[model samples]
Target: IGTGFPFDPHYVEVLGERMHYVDVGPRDGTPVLFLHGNPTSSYLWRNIIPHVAPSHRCIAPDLIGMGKSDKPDLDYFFDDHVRYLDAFIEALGLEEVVLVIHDWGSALGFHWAKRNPERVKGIACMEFIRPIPTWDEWPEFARELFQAFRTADVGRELIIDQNAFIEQVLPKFVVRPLTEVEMDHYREPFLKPVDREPLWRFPNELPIAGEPANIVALVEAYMNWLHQSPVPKLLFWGTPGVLIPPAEAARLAESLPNCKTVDIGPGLHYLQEDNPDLIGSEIARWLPAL
Candidate 1:
């Protein structure tokens, strides 16, 4: 409740339900689209927006069922996330987009870029791209610790929107603890059981391997494209995010043709919140040249 978010977010109809996003900066500025991950919303970009708005147009959207967007009863699967993004980008007629992605946003944003690679200009922020190679690089205990989420029921229990998950979870992403106000901004959207429908979708979006035939194929293709393409890429990392392990970031840096990595003072996965000025400033400097 004490979070300093003030701008009233706007909504656009995708299919029949509405979608929410914060569109800031000059219309003529180069468009930079920001995508947030699970358990957070467009609210994630609140602090980072004002800083980057001066030079580039910033667009942060609340995925369906998350944030202020309509939380209708829906599967909330991965490909569905991609489809919605595709439609939103097309409707806005965005050209030469620079995507800033985090957590689940990585997968979704990658899928969108693959579909319209010609339209994407650059990518920045910590994200999960490939696990196999990263898994090989991680220490065994650390690998198992992070892999447990999709591995078993116990891991799922830890994430099922419990109190501990909200308080202690993100610290592992960044070195410093988030202010009480920052955490509350993430909690506001899921205030009740009905509100928590969207909360469940984040965990539900993970496994992209077997049964989900169609979306699995879609995501796999995007991940492949991310490796092979010459798209400029960057990572802003804090040491503790289990998902985007240091090894994975290293692999991306070495492998991605036009890639760079920024260390945000041992922050967490959400480097934007941990070091908004540094992250925002780096993007402003790096994006234009790319």
Candidate 2:
């Protein structure tokens, strides 16, 4: 849609839904999988993918019900995401997987790595919500917003009817204003209320009330994995990175045995928009050492 996007779109049937992905770079190149989060598609990585594609194979998929992927009748829960994501990797036979994750992708990626540790080679993470063991872990400011999204009536108005994820949340986190064309590409998929179902459910997936026992356990399980796994990992965070603040990022880096952290300048939650080149170059430099 953005005049001559570098890679062609491709699809594979996984779990009866047509999953769309962009697979580019050399066949024998190191396998790198990029996963984006709520209300976003594979398009989120278009800028960063090309920088690594010259040397590394890049696969960026539109999670089911988002982007160019099929929108089936499902609640778009966390398990649903991990189910299809596992199928996608199995279907493609992707091994030695190097995961680059944002938002919901982080949770999905970590869960997959925990189950299939042998397949994962390395991890690169930025701006994602990690599941807290308890509601008390959530900041006072965050709890109210989480409650609002979990509330049926208000959640529908904010996410489903108004498409606030695309209109407000996405824009708010990005350091710069997105181009009209870019906004249009992101907005196209969730134009109708039915199309907005995935956006609405993602926030609710946060383990606010210690409900969704499976997700809470999944997070705790991965936290243990994070400490134990000796896999090479890279973390990039920026100024006012509210979701994973400086202290939290530092703690995560310290916890992982083979993890490195980079401070990309003056970005918000969507650091990709602020410093795609920085993200790409850092990864390019980091991967070879891994």
Candidate 3:
């Protein structure tokens, strides 16, 4: 168990691998599934989960090869995550799911909701990997480093060998600094360099400049459904956010049906780290309306 993670540990076998998740609240309550992205785990949802769990069943899973989940002999590709995620949900027999998603989690949840529209009740989304950015669209300081991360030897050395993603990149994205305890929990899974293969692989999965044609197509499809689907969506945005800036959130809020946008104050891509309480309270307040 993670000392920083207060929830009881639970595991289920998915695709011949052990998957770890945190499940809380009453069984009969509506299921609220939290999905986290790169360099983070179910720990991302710890504080936020409690706000909703008193009324809704909350579950947060560690993606395969990341967090406390098993790393099989696999590439840890985007498709690989989808396969395991689908199996996990089916194994739990969840329906009418309310998704609280962030970063690449947003990509996965959007894709899943698109395919299983009947199963999804609503979505509380922050950050998106789609509308895959051109270098022009990416934040200037980030673009250069991200280009290096997308490179071969340099990227591998930076992420795996040097432990750059979690130690260097992840911490910087947050406006509020993480305590040593919190940092250690995020670090515990990748103590060995070899354990960081998924960290290295994930940066390359970004659907940049229409390369990685398959992922580009996948996100495109998700956006198509997002634009048209009648699903209720709550968008939480922060000022000077890297992934979804004020303008972009405004665009989505204006165009998407039944979408409401909330300002959660100043933060970067890692909004949960910076504003967990506000994120929790806002989501708690929003859940009742559904």
Candidate 4:
């Protein structure tokens, strides 16, 4: 059978644009919010949502200008995403939260947790932006590619004009061969070149080398909060992954007083694509205590 997210869609108006989401499982269950990263949608969590749906209220949103959400006219800035997300949560009225996050999603969730510490129930993250890394800290391949992505003309050509983020960069980061259907699902939202601005902004907004001082400062604030917080946490890592590699996961684990880590076998930047079952089951295994 072809892989697909079989839930009915729900919509809410945030920032005057229609936001699409998939909310499933028990209505009264603890809210387990799934936040996906750049160039990917809630579709990225298709397989993973099922594992916890039976016991938890599983909710995943396609961030503004990405996935099935509406495309607003503003430049997809870092703070812009956070602004929309903060309001989205308030609109949904989620008081108690458990963040299952990755990539930029991690940054968004952590930033929220930093502001509303008591509302946070727990955190499970991978491949997230920790303390923004310096250029010196990046691996050679990533350094060159990210640098190219941040370059003015080069970055636009790669992400927008050529659709390189979805066509090339996305495929490279996954351990398994993504199916035609899956790729098309991601490609559907950004069919036009102009729609890829979110793709463009993500790489540029990353706080590498301290260029984006505000975001770097934000990450610093959250990283400090993350280190000291006593919330239940789960970390799923894959071999030779990009962001949360084994060593970083190990290091992050030590900083959290209440945390657990699982090796989700082989995966890369998009671990949900690689090992959804492992991630889902581990989260389900950890959910009861939270």
Give each model's whole-structure lDDT: 0.71, 0.83, 0.87, 0.88
Q: Which scores higher on TM-score, 1 or 3?
A: 3
TM value for model 4: 0.97
For residues 241-264, could you state the per-residue lDDT of candidate 3 as single tens digits? 888888999998988889989888
- lDDT ranking of the models: 4, 3, 2, 1
**Considering TM-score, which of the candidate structures 1 and 2 is the better prediction for this target?**
2
lDDT winner among the candidates? 4
Error of 4 at 154 (Å): 1.0
What CA root-mean-square deviation does each model show from the true structure? 3.3, 2.2, 1.8, 1.2
Q: How accurate is candidate 2 locally (lDDT)?
A: 0.83
Q: Which 10 consecutive positions of candidate 3 have the poorest summed lDDT?
A: 1-10
Query: Candidate 3 — which pairs collide?
Result: none
Count: clashes, candidate 2: 0
Candidate 2: Cα lDDT at 2: 28
* Error of model 2, residue 244, in angstroms: 0.4
Q: Residue by residue across 11-109, what tens digits does model 2's lDDT show? A: 999998999999998889569999999878888888888788888899999999998899989999988898898899888888778999988898888
Which of candidates 2 and 4 reaches a greater lDDT?
A: 4
TM-scores, all models, native as reference: 0.85, 0.93, 0.97, 0.97
Query: Where does model 1 exceed 4 Å of error?
Result: 1-3, 132-168, 207-217
Residue 112 lDDT, candidate 1, scale 0-100: 79
